[PDB]
Amino acid sequence: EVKLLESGPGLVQPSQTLSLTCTVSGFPLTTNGVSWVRQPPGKGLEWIAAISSGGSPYYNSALKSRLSINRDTSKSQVFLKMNSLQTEDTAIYFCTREDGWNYFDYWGPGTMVTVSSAQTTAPSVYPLAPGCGDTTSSTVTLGCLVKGYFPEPVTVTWNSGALSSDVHTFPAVLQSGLYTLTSSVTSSTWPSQTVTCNVAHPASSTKVDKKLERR
């Protein structure tokens, strides 16, 4: 019943300072330490900061200067503040508990934060069903074109996570200044069974529900 949730901006400007919040749930910051761990996109886990069940702050030596970690024991939250933000800083930020026996077992789902002077652009979702004359071969491959969005990430489901089928959600690709990604799924009850992708873009707080029609 233990839990952790990270909160914060998906896009910040360079030089500015990033402030994140880890909201703890099934345990007390009084006997559980908490740590922040970031993971660049496509790279590995980096531990950046820790705060003990006693309030003592510890940091990664490569960030020990522009890093501050504090806690609010009355509301179960740990804050991470990092200034002198730079591109390399854009990653998914996670927080974990450490209770002195179990370490880094419980993790938040994390938050992608992007350092860029750019502006957040929501995605443009288009359905992906066969041409007007290309006959179906029973089990039909479908998808959605989630394009022209910034920054990352963007997630997509089908029939509200009820399909799951063969979801081949495609790694995003940045063209010029935006990302374009495609998510595919297969199924044979469509046409009959309504299939529709559920795209969400955190940075833009937008949510789109693209119903793959017929054609």
Binding site: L45, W47, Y103, F104, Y126, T180, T182
Partner: protein, 213 residues
């Protein structure tokens, strides 16, 4: 600041093999090392703690060994769903993660079930045209592109994307998106995808009208 050095960055094996990754500490971390498995778009999952104690619910096929500065992690009889990146973590003096190791499984050989999609009505409405070709579930991961409109091979407008290895069928899927002007899309008629795998003695060309509704 103890540095962890994870060894095989990439592991390619066969269903049932026993794989082993190691990690070295720049300093004696004693027995404070953990192992995590990580699927994409998901938070790290701890499998091992204290070098060798298995986190409850962790298949007994996984295990760890080590002491001081040397440790290893093994998966005897690897399964398809072990296909995930793995990392070691020292928590003996602060915290330090190894660079990770991507485990890839070698499987049978399958051919890409290529698909084709003309720009959606909706997107043409606003004046944009985006042609997408999807070559799902195939092995190995070495595949070719090639977009041919009315015979001519256009390339100044295509993005290819290869997914990660399906932790279900040990395959790879790929997408190619040909984006162009809704006015350019009309100057042509023949839209040919066509790709050439190393499982077909020629290209698997999928083409669509242009006309139709």
């Amino acid at each position: 600041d103890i540095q962890m050095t994870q060894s095989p960055p990439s592991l390619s094996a066969s269903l049932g093999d026993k794989v082993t990754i190691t990690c070295q500490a720049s300093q004696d971390i004693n027995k404070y090392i953990a192992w995590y498995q990580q699927k994409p778009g998901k938070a790290p999952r701890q499998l091992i703690r204290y070098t060798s104690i298995l986190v409850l619910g962790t298949p007994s096929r996984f295990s760890g060994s080590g002491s001081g500065r040397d440790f290893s992690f093994s998966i005897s009889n690897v399964a398809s769903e072990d296909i995930a990146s793995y990392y070691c973590l020292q928590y003996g003096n602060l915290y330090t993660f190894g660079a990770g190791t991507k485990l890839e499984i070698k499987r049978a050989d399958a051919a890409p079930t290529v698909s084709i999609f003309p720009p959606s009505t909706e997107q043409l409405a606003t004046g944009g045209a985006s042609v997408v070709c999807l070559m799902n579930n195939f092995y190995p991961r070495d595949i070719s592109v090639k977009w041919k409109i009315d015979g001519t091979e256009r390339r100044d407008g295509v993005l290819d994307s290869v997914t990660d290895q399906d932790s279900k069928d040990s395959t790879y899927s790929m997408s190619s998106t040909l984006s162009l002007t809704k006015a350019d899309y009309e100057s042509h008629n023949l839209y040919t995808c066509e790709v050439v795998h190393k499982t077909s003695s020629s290209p698997v060309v999928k083409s669509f009208n242009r006309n139709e509704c």
